[PDB]
Amino acid sequence: AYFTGTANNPADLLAKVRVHAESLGWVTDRASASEWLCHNADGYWSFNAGANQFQMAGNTGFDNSLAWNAQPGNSVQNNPYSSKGPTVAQLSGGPFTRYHLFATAAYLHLHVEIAAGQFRPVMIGSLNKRGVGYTGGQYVCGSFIYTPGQALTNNWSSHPFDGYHIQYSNSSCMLRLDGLDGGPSPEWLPFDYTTNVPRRVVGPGRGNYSSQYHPDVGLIDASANELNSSTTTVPCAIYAFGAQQRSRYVGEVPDFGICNMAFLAPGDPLVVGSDTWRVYPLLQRGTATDFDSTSAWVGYCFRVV
Amino acid sequence: AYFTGTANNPADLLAKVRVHAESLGWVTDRASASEWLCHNADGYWSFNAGANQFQMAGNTGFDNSLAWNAQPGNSVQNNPYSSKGPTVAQLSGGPFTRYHLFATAAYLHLHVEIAAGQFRPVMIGSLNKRGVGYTGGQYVCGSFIYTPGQALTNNWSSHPFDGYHIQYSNSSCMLRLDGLDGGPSPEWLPFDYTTNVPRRVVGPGRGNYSSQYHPDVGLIDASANELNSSTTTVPCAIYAFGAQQRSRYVGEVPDFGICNMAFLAPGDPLVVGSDTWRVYPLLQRGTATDFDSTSAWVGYCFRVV
Amino acid sequence: ATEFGTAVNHADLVERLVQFLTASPDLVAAGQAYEKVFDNTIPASGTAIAVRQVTLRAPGLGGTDAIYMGIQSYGDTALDYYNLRLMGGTAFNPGAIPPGGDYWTAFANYSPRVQLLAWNQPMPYWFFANGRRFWIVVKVSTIYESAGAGFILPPCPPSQYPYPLAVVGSYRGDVATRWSDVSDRHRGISSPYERSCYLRDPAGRWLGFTVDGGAANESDYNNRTLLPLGCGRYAGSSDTVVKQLRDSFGKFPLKALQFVTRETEGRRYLGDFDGAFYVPTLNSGAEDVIVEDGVDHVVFQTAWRSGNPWLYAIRKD
Amino acid sequence: ATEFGTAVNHADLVERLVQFLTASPDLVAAGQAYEKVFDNTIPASGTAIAVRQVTLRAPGLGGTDAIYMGIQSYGDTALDYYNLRLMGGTAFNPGAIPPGGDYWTAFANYSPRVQLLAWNQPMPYWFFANGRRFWIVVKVSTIYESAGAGFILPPCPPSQYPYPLAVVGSYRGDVATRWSDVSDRHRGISSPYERSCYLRDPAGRWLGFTVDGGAANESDYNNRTLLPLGCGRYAGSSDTVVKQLRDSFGKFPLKALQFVTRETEGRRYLGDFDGAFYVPTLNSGAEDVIVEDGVDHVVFQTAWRSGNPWLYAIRKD
């Protein structure tokens, strides 16, 4: 359920997380030191480990004779982007201080502390349908950094479930929504807002950025209570846009919420109800208005079981 | 301690209050059906009952051969006023709904409901020295009405302990302060502000009137708490102005407070501590801003024993 | 707990409401019926309809809460309106009524009044009530009028915040208005504007919430708004997802309405409407009933316009 | 609980303050000593003095309360101010300090800082402390300066309002100042001005109080003031009784200081200063001691001037 450890290189994280997944019962169609083609009862995913980053891509079928980024129904070719690039998570090429892994039969969440105050979360899983009848819902997210030294959370940067980013080559996260507007079933909608594409998805990823497009940004802003120092979990709703510019609620991320870290430390416990919550910063804590050099006080909450 | 009754004429109240005072040990030097010359261990007072009003005056010595308003050291001749008028309490024809009487060995307080919603307070006693060394301190107050039908609480009106009034003939209340600024011991300081007389006294009498001169007016305004609907007692501090506009705090009114009735009815109880409080309106309840036709919500919180 | 019908006039409506509150089978069986502590008609009507004043007591679901409301009926024949006013408080005291004036001032922590617009005629109605809150909806031709009050559900224990009283109405009760008005200030519960929704701050302060700013309104309330319909604060464009929300394969998503305040001093989250949710408009409308997990919800729209951001659904249980 | 002495410098002054809070015979015997939950020096001093950060916890008289406070010693040699910043809160969390930045933000329900002005040279001092509040006064040559924080005494049971925390200082802590300032904003506790006294509302909202209004200050705080020195709200003349207050036959009357808020929403009485009163200036001044009912009181004057409104006394026990 909850695991911790250390890793000098990304390959060590890769090895330990595959060990954990196999121990849990995850089905790995192909396994290698750097390339995976795994799947579960929900969907298919493929991952590749680079020198200082991870490359992720969705999948719908298997073919061992094809490359890691050429599986049937791959997201590289089945996306509105003209660049045709897969998901990317930009990590470091050095010793990672620590990581925290949440493993389940339906989703996998990873939070890696590459260095003191530096964190790189990775999310894979499927959204809770909540009784809504739709095919797909598999989401794969990565962490991207624009430029070290300069504004780390600049406008061009992209984050998991982001709702406002500027980039023409790569996307930090992506979502699957099959059979939208009568199109072919294989559809891998990315998180973009400025491309004006007929079909796209948006999320509260960035948290409380100035130009974030989501109605719950205020809820995340007020997650902290000045009265009793109490914090509440806000469901992370995902919205999708159709050809006719008519939005449709699609669901929420299982066992995941956002809250302000204005009055809590990384990993501080606050048990709300019978369930227990683990809260860690997205990238790096700063001040309230430090939306350029760090991630401000946006906190990722995971339900620990 | 606490008495109630009815009186068809002012003479009835006269008889009942003298009976109560005598039963409580008060010493009456001379008594009659309409005139009084009484005293106690604190001071001397004289009262006269008119057709529809009471005439009161302080005293320092006794002389049975002198009229009711001609006793030694009488306030009529020993006051800065050029008119040389005694204290006056203006009432109605005599029909009284009820009267509430508070009697003690040191002070006497009366509140008569002349008619439905009409109340007239009468005050006699001495201020609590509170360790302050001064001779005198006896106070006698009455209730005066400017004109029925028109603005009842007009500027020209005067009230017990009033801090703002316009009148050249009569005063609603007085206060004794002997030997002020090296003058002769017999000195009866009236409650006036606009005469610019070298020596005068002021009080919170009017309550929370717009042009009321007292620093606690805010305390009276905020006496009612919106948090728990709780009400507190505010001591009725009195101020005396010296020969050259130098004020000297003199004391507080015993067993008396002035309190807001925004959220309370006449006579409702609100026990604060081991002591119990009785609250009855000054003249007549109105709205918040009705400072002309009625007495707004100024309240007289007393201690009942 | 729910009642649908037609009242021959505004008076008929008010005694229908009181009988529903005091004799509904669920209310009486569960011991949740409300108690009438005051009922008078003080004014001498001239060229106006008789004014009925009612104040009722409320125990709440647990029976340990003390909740007090007030209801007034006010109308004028010359202008042809029969406004019904509402207010709340924490204590009542009949003797605290001045000669003349009015009685609503006697309420402890008295709050400005809200009102519902109607007139003397057969009006279809909808009643929703519970031990902690009540909701009123009236169908006026093509216009739907609504209001209500009760307790919100804060995420904090009731021990330290036992009085989360909220009062909401279509229009401010400080002035008399005719139901035929077409001004934008006249709207529903989901979108308060110009003193249309008051809530008791844990500090006993009736803070007003407005989804949109207004010069006439006090500057204090501009910083506290209803986020779900007030997404414009952060969005850099007039058109946002909320205005373009639509069903998903025939399923109507129900979105909770939140209370939030963000001033210089601090931030806090207060609670959520109990039984009120926002829903889209396309391919739907008022009077519509949607079933989600076995509980039905009715659909209603604001009088001003029937647009996407001015349409809400209310749980009927 | 009381200590009179001379601290060789600001660092030694804070040192003596902490030793007084720890080992004072009254505090230790009664078990009212505070606990130090944090003490660090994060910054790398350049052309400035070392910065000391301290966070302490007070249990209160009954031992069931939770009080958190922080003290900072910020100075700049090239400008020669050794300011001592103060602030309060309800909880602390050392891990909530961001890389860089500061730690005072980690406080739960953080409040703007107040401060104390002095510099590195021997300085007479007057320290008053109790389980619920503390007072600091330093005689800076021609200037008397003072500050403090603690719990006020509301008239309501502590069951529902257990955190009446108040912080007051001579000047706002948002800017750096030289103790030779010539602005009217630099004054004492009895009369705050321009964010000089903050009080935590029962709704967890830090409400500042100012005796006199100010365009720079927020509009909300104008209507809430300290009545004793704010008599000008109702008086129709510049000269009032309070300005002309004087002793009576050698007896100096002590007047309690007041907290009151009169807003549009409602009114409420918050509490009084514990151990601070208003007294006149005539035939008296600073370093004066007056005994009332066997209890002594010291006399201090504001930095601005020693005028009648600009003077207050502190109980010494």
Author numbering:
A (entry chain m), B (entry chain S): 2 to 306
C (entry chain k), D (entry chain c): 2 to 318
Paper passage:
Reconstructions of the whole JBD30 baseplate and its parts enabled us to assemble a composite map that combines the localized reconstructions of the baseplate core, receptor binding proteins, and tail fibres. The bacteriophage JBD30 baseplate is composed of a trimer of distal tail proteins, three tail fibres—each composed of three heterodimers of gp47 and gp48 subunits, three upper baseplate proteins, a trimer of baseplate hub proteins, and three trimers of receptor binding proteins. The upper baseplate proteins together with the distal tail proteins form attachment sites for the tail fibres composed of three gp47 and gp48 heterodimers. Three tail fibres resembling bent arms protrude laterally from the baseplate. The baseplate of JBD30 is terminated by a tripod formed by three trimers of receptor binding proteins (gp54). The interior of most of the tail tube is occupied by a trimer of tape measure proteins (gp46). However, the cryo-EM density in the tail channel is not well resolved, except for the part in the baseplate core. The resolved density enabled building of the structure of the 33 C-terminal residues of the tape measure protein, which form a coiled coil. Residues Lys1149, Arg1151, and Gln1152 interact with Ser59, Asp61, Ser64, and Gln66 from domain I of the upper baseplate protein, and thus position the C-terminus of the tape measure protein in the middle of the tube. Methionines 1130 and 1134 from the C-terminal domain of the three tape measure proteins coordinate a putative ion positioned on the tail axis.
Bacteriophage Casadabanvirus JBD30, from the order Caudoviricetes, is a temperate phage that infects the bacterium Pseudomonas aeruginosa. The virion of bacteriophage JBD30 is composed of an icosahedral capsid, long flexible non-contractile tail, and a baseplate. Using its baseplate, JBD30 attaches to Pseudomonas aeruginosa via the bacterial type IV pilus, whose subsequent retraction brings the phage to the bacterial cell surface.
